[PDB]
Amino acid sequence: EEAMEMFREDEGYIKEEERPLPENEFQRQVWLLFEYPESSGPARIIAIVSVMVILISIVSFCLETLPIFRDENEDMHGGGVTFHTYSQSTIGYQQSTSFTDPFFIVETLCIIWFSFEFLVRFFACPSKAGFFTNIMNIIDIVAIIPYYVTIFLTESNKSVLQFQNVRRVVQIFRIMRILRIFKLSRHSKGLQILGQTLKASMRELGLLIFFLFIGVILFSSAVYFAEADERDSQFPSIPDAFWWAVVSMTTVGYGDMVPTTIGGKIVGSLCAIAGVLTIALPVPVIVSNFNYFYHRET
Amino acid sequence: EEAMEMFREDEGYIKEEERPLPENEFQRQVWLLFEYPESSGPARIIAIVSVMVILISIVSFCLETLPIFRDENEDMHGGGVTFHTYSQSTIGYQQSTSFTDPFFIVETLCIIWFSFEFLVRFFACPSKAGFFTNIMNIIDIVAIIPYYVTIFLTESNKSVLQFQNVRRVVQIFRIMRILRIFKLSRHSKGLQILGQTLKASMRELGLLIFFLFIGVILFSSAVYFAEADERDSQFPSIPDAFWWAVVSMTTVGYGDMVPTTIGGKIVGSLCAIAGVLTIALPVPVIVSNFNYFYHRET
Amino acid sequence: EEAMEMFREDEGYIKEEERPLPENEFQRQVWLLFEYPESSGPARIIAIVSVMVILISIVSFCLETLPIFRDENEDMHGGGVTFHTYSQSTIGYQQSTSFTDPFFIVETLCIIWFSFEFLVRFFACPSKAGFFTNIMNIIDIVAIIPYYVTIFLTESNKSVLQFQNVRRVVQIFRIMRILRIFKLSRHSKGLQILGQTLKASMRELGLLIFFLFIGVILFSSAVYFAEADERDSQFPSIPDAFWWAVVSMTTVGYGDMVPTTIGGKIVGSLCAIAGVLTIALPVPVIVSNFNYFYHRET
Amino acid sequence: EEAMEMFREDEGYIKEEERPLPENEFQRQVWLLFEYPESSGPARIIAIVSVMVILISIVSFCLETLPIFRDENEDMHGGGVTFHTYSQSTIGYQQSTSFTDPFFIVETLCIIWFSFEFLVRFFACPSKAGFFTNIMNIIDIVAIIPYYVTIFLTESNKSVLQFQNVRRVVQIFRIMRILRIFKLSRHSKGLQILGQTLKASMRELGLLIFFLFIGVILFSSAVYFAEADERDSQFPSIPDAFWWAVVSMTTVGYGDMVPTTIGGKIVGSLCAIAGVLTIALPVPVIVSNFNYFYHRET
């Protein structure tokens, strides 16, 4: 049994996964209801629920921004900014105990599900200390927080001049809601394969960014000086032209700004070729890993 | 003979195709005239006809939309909308027993060929009940339908206020004519290989769309809030910015809308790289299958 | 010696190249001076000359079009059209026995080299009948012809009303000069490998064009009807939208015309993905051949 | 020991690296402090310093161009040109013994490090003659020079009418500062793998450029004549259209100029496909080498 384990690790057939139960025999049993969808029919249903749950939050998150509805705000004409209208304009919902804001309800509804997932999952974990080394528990935590950041801003604060301390910092938090989408990782097998391919390429991915950081700087400058002697130049500075080379090394290619001089085109056309020769060097490094981690289940 | 068949299936040399005739001995014989082009010279000719047939419909379909001819319509100046002018403007041809509309003739001509293909092929099929599991018979059916839907709209309807019930539903049908192009599958060997490669990738293709659906939502939002505090922003909402990230993860890159702020470019430039790292993960999954299904004839 | 040749052909080590000399013993000897650069120092020199010759013609061809010089034409203001100014405006040079046009000299100089290559190569060929099956002799012929087509229009014609018979047909010929660039094939080893890779892919390349021809039609139509109900639509017809889908299946992506409606974007964004899934299916079919034909010299 | 070395070279396990010390025993000992970071803690620190050094110069180089600061120049309004304001406008810093220009200090500070790297590295080299064959010493030299070219222009010249001799030649030098970024090659292992992959591809890379040079010329001309008979054409000449085909063979795709005629689109759409069939032929030639040179450390 000892030289067989050294054989499979060389082979890579290393599956040491053994889910220990919580030992309560119902603290154990209910734990497996929320750790394994394959134990029963209703065990699937929880996954069937929670996968659908995340989508409901997202559509509710995206529709707040819609100008059928953000133009149907408290500032439907958009004249000033109030302390209570800051929530309708920079938090995207109207907090009220009456809760006439429909989205503010729908936002809140999923959070009740997420904690009752998570907290019940926290109380029934066998491994208590190493709970926060698991990455698929971290996303659970970061999801539920700007909910509470919203409320403590509303409940605790009864004062003036709070926007001069932190107001766009609140607007940062309105983004960071967006990484609730990573909660699908617990359900998709395939999204974890991305999560492992990146985990197995964190140095070779750094070959890409560093080779692009070289490519950006070299050709942003070299086009800036060939487009230098215009009064009418589209390239005012070199950190303007960092936007230009990533538009043209990644071959997206926009048209917002394009070189105009005879030299700036000759410079500009090398950068089109060299972006192929910068992305494609460490891409098949990655994709061979992803192909390997995909069929590694077989 | 028993352990040889288990050998070839492991190998993949599994060709169990055996075309049974219809047994009529002319019901059988004429069936093979319209199932196999290789039985005779004229057996090729039917395929040589029917391949040329489909093209004639397409050019006749596309030229209806041309403003040498849709501007040479009954509303050549475009003032109003009549019940009979709905056919020339939303069905694309003028139905008449005189049939002065030339395209309306040419459209009708191919349909006579298609049924006389199909209906004769229906009566001479050996497999009678399993006729509608064959996908290359489904396209035959979907081709001939909006022809009849056009006529029943003309024949049965003599009444007022029909556009308030279904008029854009008619305009849907004018699209669905377009999938007559898939009828070439019966003739091209290579188009069926695409039909099989997709048939062997319907989960791994779903890795692509789901990894892109992740990529779209994450960066559409993250550019929306870095482009937030403009009165002059090109990004009014987040479902506006779903158009933006598929223009920029697929590296098409249009120029209709591009970020402008300092933050929106830094967000916007990550999304150029990440679209490479989203398409290219399950593409060589597919292309290895297609290369495998191509030479599988050898 | 017989089962060794069957071995190498299976292997692919099939090099039956045996250059028979012209047998004149100076017709033979001068032949190797103009077929093999490796026989001597001066044998290289002709190859060094003729490679430099082609470039001289090209720069002379491209500079005619330059508006430092085509605006310095006989119609420097561009008011009318003369029969003698047709050469300076649609043949790009001024033919005269004085030949004051400098480019018209430089154009003429190279043709003297090409024939004295070719005609001397014609008279000293061992194989006289199969001379015109060799493709690298066809390019020799097609190069020298529109030179003579230029002169016969000048020399033979002294009459009126020739532009109503053929005038843009002359302008066709001014293009077809451009395939003089393929004359480098006799000199580059690498350009012939492209010439062989295409020669070994003429069916599998046809998988690409036909899969793209499917992709173009299916999405040009499907965006035309989602962009139909505008008075302000960017898509007037469907053969307008053939330009649109090759801008967007090949992911070039211009911005001349982009969909605007909610449906036209959803249609338009599928076509971005599907162009990856159309180019990349028969590309590694080709590139595996090119990699094979490249190192086939080793 | 003799047939083992012939074995490893076939294998490619050829590591003949033997760093001979300078033999001074402190000239030797200090040499390893500036050639090997792995000898000690402080040996790392010099590499930790000098990697951070280069970045400081770059940010200082890029920020000079910023119109928070180049508009805060001596010509903050930009009316004329002085002999002393040429440094603030075309050398990017204000040279003085007072040195009130802050960047001109920060520029100067890094050069003191680079020479004290290099000159100390020069005096302690074992190999003195072949010092300038090593490429990672050339980059050291070309870095430090336009610093001195700046000073000798200021120190030696006290005269008039120097701009009519060389003024944009000075502006050339302001670019050539930019290749100080290649100094990271001594530190990154991965950037040298790029440096070796290009060193192992200098003929096969030339397959790419020459196949593109063919592709550019053939389609720039062929679109010029299909877009010829406009008064309103976007393509004035053929070397205008060299910018067009590299925008469209590399599939960047800008929108600055796009064909408009019916023929110019049919020409223009072939060039989209053919740029895929020109980049992708010698790319996996390269990327296989880079993948090989990456893991060649293992």
Author numbering:
A (entry chain F), B (entry chain H), C (entry chain B), D (entry chain D): 120 to 417
From the paper:
Voltage-activated potassium (Kv) channels open in response to membrane depolarization to conduct K+ ions, a process that is critical for electrical signaling in neurons and endocrine cells, as well as muscle contraction. Kv channels contain voltage-sensing domains that activate with membrane depolarization, and a central pore domain that opens to conduct K+ ions with high selectivity. The X-ray crystal structure of Kv1.2, a mammalian homolog of the Shaker Kv channel, and those of the Kv1.2–2.1 chimera containing the S3b-S4 paddle motif from Kv2.1 (Kv chimera), serve as a structural framework for understanding the gating mechanism of Kv channels. Since no structure has been obtained for a voltage-activated ion channel in a membrane environment, in the present study we solved the structure of the Kv chimera reconstituted in a lipid nanodisc environment using single-particle cryo-electron microscopy (cryo-EM).
The additional two maps showed higher resolution for each domain (3 Å for the cytosolic domain with local higher resolution as high as ~2.5 Å, and ~4 Å for the transmembrane region with local higher resolution of up to ~3.0 Å), which we used to build models of the Kv channel. Although the transmembrane domain exhibits overall lower resolution than the cytosolic domain, we see cryo-EM densities for all transmembrane helices (S1-S6) with densities visible for many of the bulky side chains, which enabled us to refine a model for the entire complex. In addition, the central pore domain shows higher local resolutions (3–4 Å) compared to the peripheral voltage-sensing domains (resolutions of ~4–6 Å), with the lowest resolution for the peripheral loops in the latter domain. Overall, the transmembrane domain only shows minimal structural differences when compared to the crystal structure, suggesting that the X-ray structure is representative of the structure of the protein in a membrane environment. For the intracellular end of the pore where the activation gate resides, we observed no discernable structural differences between the cryo-EM and X-ray structures. Within the external pore region that has been implicated in C-type inactivation, we see no evidence for significant constriction or dilation of the pore. In our structure of the Kv chimera, sidechain density for D375 (equivalent to D447 in Shaker) is weak compared to other nearby residues, including W362, Y373, M376 and V377, raising the possibility that the critical hydrogen bond between D375 in the P-loop and W362 in the pore helix may be broken.
